[PDB]
Amino acid sequence: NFRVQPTESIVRFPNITNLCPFGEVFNATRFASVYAWNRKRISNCVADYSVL
Amino acid sequence: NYKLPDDFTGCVIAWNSNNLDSKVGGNYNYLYRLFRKSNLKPFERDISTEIYQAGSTPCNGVEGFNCYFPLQSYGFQPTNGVGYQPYRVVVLSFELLHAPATVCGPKKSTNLVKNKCVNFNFNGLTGTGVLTESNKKFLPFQQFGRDIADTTDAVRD
Amino acid sequence: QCVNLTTRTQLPPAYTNSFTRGVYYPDKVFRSSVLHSTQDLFLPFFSNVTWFHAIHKRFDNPVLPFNDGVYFASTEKSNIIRGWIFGTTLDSKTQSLLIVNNATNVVIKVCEFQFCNDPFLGVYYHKNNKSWMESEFRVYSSANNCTFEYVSQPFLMDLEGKQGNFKNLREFVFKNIDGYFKIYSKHTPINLVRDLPQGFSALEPLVDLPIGINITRFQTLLALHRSSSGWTAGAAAYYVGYLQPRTFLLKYNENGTITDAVDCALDPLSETKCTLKSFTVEKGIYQTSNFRVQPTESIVRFPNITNLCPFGEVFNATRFASVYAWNRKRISNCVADYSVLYNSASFSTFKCYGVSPTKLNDLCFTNVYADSFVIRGDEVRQIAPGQTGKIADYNYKLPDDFTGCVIAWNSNNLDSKVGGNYNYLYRLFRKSNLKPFERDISTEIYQAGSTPCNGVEGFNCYFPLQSYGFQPTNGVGYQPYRVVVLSFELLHAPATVCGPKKSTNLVKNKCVNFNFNGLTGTGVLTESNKKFLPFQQFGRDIADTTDAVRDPQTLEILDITPCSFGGVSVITPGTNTSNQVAVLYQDVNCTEV
Amino acid sequence: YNSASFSTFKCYGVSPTKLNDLCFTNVYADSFVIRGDEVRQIAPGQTGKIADY
Amino acid sequence: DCTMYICGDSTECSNLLLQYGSFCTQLNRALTGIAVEQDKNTQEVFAQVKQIYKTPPIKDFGGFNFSQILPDPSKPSKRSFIEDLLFNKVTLADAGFIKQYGDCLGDIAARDLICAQKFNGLTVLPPLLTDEMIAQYTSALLAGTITSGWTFGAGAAL
Amino acid sequence: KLQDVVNQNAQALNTLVKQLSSNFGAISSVLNDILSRLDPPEAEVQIDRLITG
Numbered sequence A: 001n002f003r004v005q006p007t008e009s010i011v012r013f014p015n016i017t018n019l020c021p022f023g024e025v026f027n028a029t030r031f032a033s034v035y036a037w038n039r040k041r042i043s044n045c046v047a048d049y050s051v052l
Numbered sequence B: 001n002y003k004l005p006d007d008f009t010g011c012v013i014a015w016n017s018n019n020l021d022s023k024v025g026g027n028y029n030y031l032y033r034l035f036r037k038s039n040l041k042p043f044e045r046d047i048s049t050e051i052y053q054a055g056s057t058p059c060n061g062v063e064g065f066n067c068y069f070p071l072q073s074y075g076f077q078p079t080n081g082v083g084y085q086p087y088r089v090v091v092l093s094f095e096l097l098h099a100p101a102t103v104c105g106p107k108k109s110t111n112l113v114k115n116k117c118v119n120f121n122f123n124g125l126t127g128t129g130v131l132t133e134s135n136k137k138f139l140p141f142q143q144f145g146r147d148i149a150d151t152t153d154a155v156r157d
Numbered sequence C: 001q002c003v004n005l006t007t008r009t010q011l012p013p014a015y016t017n018s019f020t021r022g023v024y025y026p027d028k029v030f031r032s033s034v035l036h037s038t039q040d041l042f043l044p045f046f047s048n049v050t051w052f053h054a055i056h057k058r059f060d061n062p063v064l065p066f067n068d069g070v071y072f073a074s075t076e077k078s079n080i081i082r083g084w085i086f087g088t089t090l091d092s093k094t095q096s097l098l099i100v101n102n103a104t105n106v107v108i109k110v111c112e113f114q115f116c117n118d119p120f121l122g123v124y125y126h127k128n129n130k131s132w133m134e135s136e137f138r139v140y141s142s143a144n145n146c147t148f149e150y151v152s153q154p155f156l157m158d159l160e161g162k163q164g165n166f167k168n169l170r171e172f173v174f175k176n177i178d179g180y181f182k183i184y185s186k187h188t189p190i191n192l193v194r195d196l197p198q199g200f201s202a203l204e205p206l207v208d209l210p211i212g213i214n215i216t217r218f219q220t221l222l223a224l225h226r227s228s229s230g231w232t233a234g235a236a237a238y239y240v241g242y243l244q245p246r247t248f249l250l251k252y253n254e255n256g257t258i259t260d261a262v263d264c265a266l267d268p269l270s271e272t273k274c275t276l277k278s279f280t281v282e283k284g285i286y287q288t289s290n291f292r293v294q295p296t297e298s299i300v301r302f303p304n305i306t307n308l309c310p311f312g313e314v315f316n317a318t319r320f321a322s323v324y325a326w327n328r329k330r331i332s333n334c335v336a337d338y339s340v341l342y343n344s345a346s347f348s349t350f351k352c353y354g355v356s357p358t359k360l361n362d363l364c365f366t367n368v369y370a371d372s373f374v375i376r377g378d379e380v381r382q383i384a385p386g387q388t389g390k391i392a393d394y395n396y397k398l399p400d401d402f403t404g405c406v407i408a409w410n411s412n413n414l415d416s417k418v419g420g421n422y423n424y425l426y427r428l429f430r431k432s433n434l435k436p437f438e439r440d441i442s443t444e445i446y447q448a449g450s451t452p453c454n455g456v457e458g459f460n461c462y463f464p465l466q467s468y469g470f471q472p473t474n475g476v477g478y479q480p481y482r483v484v485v486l487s488f489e490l491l492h493a494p495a496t497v498c499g500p501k502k503s504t505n506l507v508k509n510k511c512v513n514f515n516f517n518g519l520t521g522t523g524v525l526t527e528s529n530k531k532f533l534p535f536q537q538f539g540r541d542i543a544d545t546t547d548a549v550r551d552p553q554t555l556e557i558l559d560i561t562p563c564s565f566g567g568v569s570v571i572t573p574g575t576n577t578s579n580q581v582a583v584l585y586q587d588v589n590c591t592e593v
Numbered sequence D: 001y002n003s004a005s006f007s008t009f010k011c012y013g014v015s016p017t018k019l020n021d022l023c024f025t026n027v028y029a030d031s032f033v034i035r036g037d038e039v040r041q042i043a044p045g046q047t048g049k050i051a052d053y
Numbered sequence E: 001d002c003t004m005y006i007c008g009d010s011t012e013c014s015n016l017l018l019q020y021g022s023f024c025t026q027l028n029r030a031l032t033g034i035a036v037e038q039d040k041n042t043q044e045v046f047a048q049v050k051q052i053y054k055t056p057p058i059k060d061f062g063g064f065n066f067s068q069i070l071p072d073p074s075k076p077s078k079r080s081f082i083e084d085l086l087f088n089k090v091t092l093a094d095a096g097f098i099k100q101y102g103d104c105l106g107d108i109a110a111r112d113l114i115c116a117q118k119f120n121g122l123t124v125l126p127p128l129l130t131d132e133m134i135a136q137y138t139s140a141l142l143a144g145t146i147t148s149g150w151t152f153g154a155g156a157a158l
Numbered sequence F: 001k002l003q004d005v006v007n008q009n010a011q012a013l014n015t016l017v018k019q020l021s022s023n024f025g026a027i028s029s030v031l032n033d034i035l036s037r038l039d040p041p042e043a044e045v046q047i048d049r050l051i052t053g
């Protein structure tokens, strides 16, 4: 077929300025026990593991 | 006590807590389930402290012969072997590309281009195509539309 | 709270038919003008559902089995359906889900609940000042150890009583899979007297609750009224039906809303629609599939034995052999249960190469040998098929095809003694690469040079066995790890060792789900004239599938005949003409139907 | 093996039992020191302050 | 049956095969296309005429003996002596296309081909036209050739 | 000529049954052997080899 190469790379993500709670999750003071383990919903943030 | 799905899509993260979670003679605040009657389905939390019955005689909710309290504690000491040292663990679970994504990493979005062949990335979904306005109306829970070929026909900005 | 109802009247559990009800969007993906075949938990079409009501003498909120998932449908006027309780035993002994509506907020809480036998929410004493406001909250006595809570935004529900037909239809799909609670809600306005409205509505996902509990049972909340057991019930109804792993076609329109669906398992006609991938079947005959007989019950048959395998004599043994000469203990005629190993728990690495560890209880093994020895910490990776190292490359090798489990744990707390433990040696120098499972005990001096060593140490002459330094202060890489390598042949021979899975009764001449010595399958068990040799366990056919097994408890030879036999045809005029179908059953007499 | 060390030995392109039977063209020894928990970060496709940077 | 042949009596496997989709449908679409044209092949050969012709009871052919090629009512299925030889010199499957499940279940013949094919999802569809009917097409085409000459193919039998 | 029609049709069906004893690269040709041994993650890898074959 007649191939049209992409002109430019477009990136579209949901804008948000908040970093995800890497401190409240990984740096938290005391985790729950394994039998009853805390499940924290991570939503409406930016997940960046460079901060870790 | 803690099971993961066979189809589980996510990341498992663990690191040593020995420098913290190990206290003096022991840390008993972290328990575990030694005895469970069945194998619980993945992502299932069992908080029940009811006495496990290992024998034929009903335990009636008290400890005894062939009756064991289901929760036991790990010995936590800074002098324990690294195999017995506590590891904090965080298991990140997610559905992916099949729904709208509220959490998106530190990749700056670009300008939106229509009526031109571009390399597009929407909520982590990368591909090459031409973006055009449509009369399709996605339901509030719908993110990516798909065709007979199952490839993505339409996205939602 | 603990107060039960009195005026409740005992009536038979009547049943109802759901027409297309139970269809929901399987995923968040948009689809337009396509017919999509999906496989998920669904309420089958024309399935038998349950008949419940609230009325001035019938009041029904019984405990109902959740099974794999349930479809909820309620024709409502006064908003009598306030929510549900989801749990296992419905007591504080377990953790249960509570989804309710207290008129202000939508309350979703996962707690440890003290469970009332008759939960409800009352509305009281109108007369002048028409009111319709709540008073008592009766659903639970106490809630402790809450692992999840959701409180919606404040809203004012209209609680006023209505008369005549139901103006509201609230449909819900409840399924809990992978500790993940999916709710699919659809609300359409209706005008209906009784029964359930004939029509189609595509239920949409509301939220996804990460409850993570077991839910074998549920109840529905109701509202009570009077002009505390002397209340009455406002007029309402709700319908419960059970989801099943059914395949549906889903017809999306231009907009994207599902217009109609077809349950592939209804009749041979609807299966033709699924194969043809259209709702309009042309006039003629269409081969669908054979006539499938589902297994009635799951049968498990293992060799009876009351002895647990020597987990104490193997894993808890005082001193393991050295790696160069390693003890091989045959494990036979016992029950292999690794739950006992949890009391004193050790293992650092557990790897089963030939099997999956979750099947170790369901599956059992023929000739089990525990390969036990002690090695340095960094050398445990060297135990695996295809590894190289002074363990793998010289003294202890594993087969490339090796089927078994490798188990290792730290012995530093024991095998490390004071300045060193030299009782555990290893082979530093070996002339060749020995074949797998080969023990070399030879202490003959290795020749590293051209000059013959003549059995004495010297230049380019090294004694082949060396010792690991064992100290409690050594690095964990140098700390000794005890290691036990379990090796077995599997499913190809008779199995003396079988795990703690209790055998069931033996069923003949009926389609069942059978388990013999860990071999699971579906078929019909029948007596046979085949005589297996004393070493023969499973017989096989040209297809290589198992034709016959040998009952491990009492000796007999049972042929395994596959279920789901004989051809099925669909004789129909075009669906535009009539929906009546004739079903030709090939290879059969008139019996199954 | 005389002085034996290695904690982890992983050959991605070959099988270690063939290292004696097979030999290689241009061999480069990439040598450095990292923290203990970062050794997993050395592998194709890993991420971490070692791999990711 | 491509769900049965691939995954025998297995839900876990059948759920994986449904990810392959139209593969199972397109194979049967081609096998059905064969099964339709094989009944069409027989329809084009043995029935070229709408009328079923029978020879009159009084036989005078001029000395020509056709009793060997003409059907014999004495047999249960009306057939010529030659068609009886033709059916006996070609070995087929078991008489009739109906093989009971209890026939395979109640007695398992050691290395039995037809049952093993059917338990693997391989079904032999019966032809639309029985050999008893095919013998009656050849009888009609033969009775017209004998009595009416070649005129019955171009029109009414004369 | 007509016996060959019956033979080839029977041989092709009989061969198609013999096709089921092929492992297809999977650990075993039996579908029940894989389900009774490997988890669905490890079974799907083995079963998809059987399905493809």
Ligand SMILES: *[C@@H]1O[C@H](CO)[C@@H](O[C@@H]2O[C@H](CO)[C@@H](O)[C@H](O)[C@H]2NC(C)=O)[C@H](O)[C@H]1NC(C)=O
Pocket (backbone or CB within 6 Å): B037, B038, B039, B040, B041, C088, C089, C214, C215, C216
């Ligand atoms: C979920 O709950 C159900 C109901 O309690 C469990 O099924 C029970 O299993 C026990 C054995 O552990 C039996 O004694 C009961 O008779 C069963 N009850 C019924 C009626 O099913 C089921 O095992 C639980 N599942 C998990 C993994 O927790």
Ligand SMILES: *[C@@H]1O[C@H](CO)[C@@H](O[C@@H]2O[C@H](CO)[C@@H](O)[C@H](O)[C@H]2NC(C)=O)[C@H](O)[C@H]1NC(C)=O
Pocket (backbone or CB within 6 Å): C002, C003, C004, C117
């Ligand atoms: C209400 O019904 C229950 C049965 O569902 C009656 O049974 C008692 O229920 C209470 C909890 O409410 C238990 O503590 C008792 O042990 C139960 N007794 C027995 C023998 O089952 C209860 O008596 C009824 N009355 C009330 C006021 O709850």
Ligand SMILES: *[C@@H]1O[C@H](CO)[C@@H](O[C@@H]2O[C@H](CO)[C@@H](O)[C@H](O)[C@H]2NC(C)=O)[C@H](O)[C@H]1NC(C)=O
Pocket (backbone or CB within 6 Å): C102, C103, C104, C105, C107, C134, C137, C151
């Ligand atoms: C409707 O629901 C809301 C939320 O459950 C109730 O308001 C709560 O009342 C308690 C009383 O102790 C407070 O502790 C909570 O903080 C309140 N809600 C919140 C989110 O703060 C309200 O009472 C309910 N109304 C009725 C009468 O059922």
Ligand SMILES: *[C@@H]1O[C@H](CO)[C@@H](O[C@@H]2O[C@H](CO)[C@@H](O)[C@H](O)[C@H]2NC(C)=O)[C@H](O)[C@H]1NC(C)=O
Pocket (backbone or CB within 6 Å): A036, B047, B049, C144, C145, C146
């Ligand atoms: C679940 O509830 C139980 C009992 O309500 C808790 O166990 C008690 O917790 C308290 C407070 O920490 C202690 O003082 C008691 O000694 C504990 N034992 C008992 C039998 O009361 C348990 O900690 C709770 N766990 C969760 C998951 O919330």
Ligand SMILES: *[C@@H]1O[C@H](CO)[C@@H](O[C@@H]2O[C@H](CO)[C@@H](O)[C@H](O)[C@H]2NC(C)=O)[C@H](O)[C@H]1NC(C)=O
Pocket (backbone or CB within 6 Å): C431, C432, C433, C434, C435
């Ligand atoms: C098994 O034993 C044979 C016989 O000793 C080994 O073959 C010998 O290998 C050595 C070198 O290691 C040669 O010097 C001998 O001449 C060989 N003998 C013969 C006649 O084969 C073989 O290597 C051994 N295999 C293992 C892995 O131990």
Ligand SMILES: *[C@@H]1O[C@H](CO)[C@@H](O[C@@H]2O[C@H](CO)[C@@H](O)[C@H](O)[C@H]2NC(C)=O)[C@H](O)[C@H]1NC(C)=O
Pocket (backbone or CB within 6 Å): E059, E064, E065, E066, E067, E068
């Ligand atoms: C055609 O040939 C057949 C066979 O020869 C004739 O049938 C025979 O008839 C005689 C009596 O005339 C019997 O004795 C034979 O046993 C018959 N043979 C068979 C095989 O049936 C038949 O009569 C002949 N027809 C004509 C018109 O000549």
Ligand SMILES: *[C@@H]1O[C@H](CO)[C@@H](O)[C@H](O)[C@H]1NC(C)=O
Pocket (backbone or CB within 6 Å): A022, A023, A027, A051, A052
């Ligand atoms: C974690 O907590 C420590 C100690 O308070 C702090 O030094 C460090 O910066 C924290 N790390 C992150 C990722 O926030």
Ligand SMILES: *[C@@H]1O[C@H](CO)[C@@H](O)[C@H](O)[C@H]1NC(C)=O
Pocket (backbone or CB within 6 Å): C015, C016, C017, C047, C048, C049
């Ligand atoms: C529902 O099942 C019962 C048997 O429990 C049966 O008698 C009744 O006719 C069924 N109802 C429908 C809708 O077929």
Ligand SMILES: *[C@@H]1O[C@H](CO)[C@@H](O)[C@H](O)[C@H]1NC(C)=O
Pocket (backbone or CB within 6 Å): C129, C131, C133
């Ligand atoms: C009317 O009912 C409302 C709601 O219960 C109550 O708040 C109010 O005090 C009542 N007013 C009168 C006049 O009784």
Ligand SMILES: *[C@@H]1O[C@H](CO)[C@@H](O)[C@H](O)[C@H]1NC(C)=O
Pocket (backbone or CB within 6 Å): C253, C254, C255
């Ligand atoms: C689909 O959407 C269009 C535009 O909103 C509307 O006119 C039409 O009625 C909807 N339904 C159908 C039949 O596609």
Ligand SMILES: *[C@@H]1O[C@H](CO)[C@@H](O)[C@H](O)[C@H]1NC(C)=O
Pocket (backbone or CB within 6 Å): C311, C312, C316, C340, C341, C342, C343, C344
């Ligand atoms: C192993 O031995 C220890 C110490 O004697 C004992 O405490 C433990 O119960 C044993 N474990 C098993 C599985 O027998």
Ligand SMILES: *[C@@H]1O[C@H](CO)[C@@H](O)[C@H](O)[C@H]1NC(C)=O
Pocket (backbone or CB within 6 Å): C304, C305, C553, C554
């Ligand atoms: C095992 O069960 C069989 C019956 O299935 C019985 O004949 C045999 O004696 C039993 N063996 C033992 C010792 O449990």
Ligand SMILES: *[C@@H]1O[C@H](CO)[C@@H](O)[C@H](O)[C@H]1NC(C)=O
Pocket (backbone or CB within 6 Å): C280, C576
């Ligand atoms: C259905 O039959 C009607 C009446 O003969 C005809 O008008 C119509 O075109 C048919 N529709 C389809 C989909 O075949």
Ligand SMILES: *[C@@H]1O[C@H](CO)[C@@H](O)[C@H](O)[C@H]1NC(C)=O
Pocket (backbone or CB within 6 Å): C588, C589, C590, E098
């Ligand atoms: C079914 O069985 C009867 C005898 O019970 C027999 O007469 C009939 O021909 C059989 N039909 C089939 C399926 O061939």
